[PDB]
Amino acid sequence: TSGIVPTLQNIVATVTLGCRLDLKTVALHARNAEYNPKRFAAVIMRIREPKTTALIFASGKMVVTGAKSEDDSKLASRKYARIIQKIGFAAKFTDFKIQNIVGSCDVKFPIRLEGLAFSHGTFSSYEPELFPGLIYRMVKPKIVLLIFVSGKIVLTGAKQREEIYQAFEAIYPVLSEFRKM
DNA sequence: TCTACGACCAACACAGCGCAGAAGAGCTATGATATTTTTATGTATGTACAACACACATCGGAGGTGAATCGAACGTTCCATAGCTATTATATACACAGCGTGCT
Numbered sequence: 001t002s003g004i005v006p007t008l009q010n011i012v013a014t015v016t017l018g019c020r021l022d023l024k025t026v027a028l029h030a031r032n033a034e035y036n037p038k039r040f041a042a043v044i045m046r047i048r049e050p051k052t053t054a055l056i057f058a059s060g061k062m063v064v065t066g067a068k069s070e071d072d073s074k075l076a077s078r079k080y081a082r083i084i085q086k087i088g089f090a091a092k093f094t095d096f097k098i099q100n101i102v103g104s105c106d107v108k109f110p111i112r113l114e115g116l117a118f119s120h121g122t123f124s125s126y127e128p129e130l131f132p133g134l135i136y137r138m139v140k141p142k143i144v145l146l147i148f149v150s151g152k153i154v155l156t157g158a159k160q161r162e163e164i165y166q167a168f169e170a171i172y173p174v175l176s177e178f179r180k181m
Numbered sequence: 182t183c184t185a186c187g188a189c190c191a192a193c194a195c196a197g198c199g200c201a202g203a204a205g206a207g208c209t210a211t212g213a214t215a216t217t218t219t220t221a222t223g224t225a226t227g228t229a230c231a232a233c234a235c236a237c238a239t240c241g242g243a244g245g246t247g248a249a250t251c252g253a254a255c256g257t258t259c260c261a262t263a264g265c266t267a268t269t270a271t272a273t274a275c276a277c278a279g280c281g282t283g284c285t
Contacts, residue, residue, distance in 0.1 A: 010271035040268055053269060065270035104272040132274050146273060154272050 002172045004105055006155055006164055011067040012100035015077045017060035017084060017091035026056065029087050045080065052076040056084075060091065070098055070160075101158035105168060107151040110180035116147065120174060136171065143167035147175070 023043045027035035035043040046053040050072050055063040062080070067073035077096060084091040113134050117126035126134045133154075134147040141163040146154035153171070158164040 008271095010269095012270070042268075044269075046269095051270095055269065063269075065268095067270085100270090102271055128275090132276095148273060150274080152273055156272085 002169060004107070006103040006105035006153070006168050008068055008101055008103035008161075008164075010065060010100070010102045011070060011073045011098055013064045013067070013070075013073045013077065013096060013098040015062040015064065015081070015096050016094045017056075017062055017081065017089075018094045019060045019090050019092070021056065021058055021060050021084070021089055021091070023056070023058050026084070026087055026089075030083060045083075047076070047079060047083075049079075050076040054080045056080070073098065098159060100156070101160070101164055102154065102156040103158070103164050105153050105155070107153060107172070107175060109151050110149055111147060111151060111175055112178040112180050113147060113149060116175065116178050138167055138170065141167055145171060149180075 023035050023037075027033045027043050030045060032047065033043055033045045042055045042057045044053065044055055046066075050067055052064055052066040052073065054076070055065070062077065064073050064077050064080070067076055074096060078093070081091050081093050113126055113128075116136075117124045117134055120136070123138065124134055124136050132148065134145075136145040136147055138145065142157060143155050143163055144157050145167070146156070153168065153175075155164045155167055158167070
């Protein structure tokens, strides 16, 4: 067991609004709406109360990023869809699928990263020239982990909570064995 | 008037003519020779042919080269496809570039 549970910091989800959207009008009429078709083929909006960000496409496909919890992402998608209703489009809410749940935690001890890369070499790839963190790719569940010398752990690539939590619980014994000073 | 010159006589002897023999002038006949006739005999001529050997223009094969003609490599363009590029949120942490400031 571990005395600390990871805390989430970003949830990436998608919603199908089910209607063709004219990105020209939603940029002009919505308040915080940025449309640069040369730079990107979507309109970026963000609203203050969930601190999220919606990438809205012409086909009606939607991306919600920046949420802390699944209910927060659901509420953010609800309010962005309500904005699209108030702007003059028939954007029926159809589905809501959360793809990414990245959460960070701290084991509060220094880690010997080279020894961990040497021991669990089939799942790890340490290249401190490029990035100062170790990339651990767990096979079950499919969660990737960024491991650092300060003990900070970044778990990325979860669909719901019961992957990142058990990923941390499985990665804790193989990091408790590596301690510096 | 008369003196040169011619008649006249004798002797004779040497020229002159009869006679016979020679001889040769001129005609006549016959053989040899050169001249013309005839023919005949070989030669020349226009034009054609053929046989044969050599030489030469003409046709044809061997070789060389410009003009013409072939492939082959390559650049370019298009159809379709797939793979990539770009954003955003977020924790984490380190390395480098760039800019505001200030005080040495």
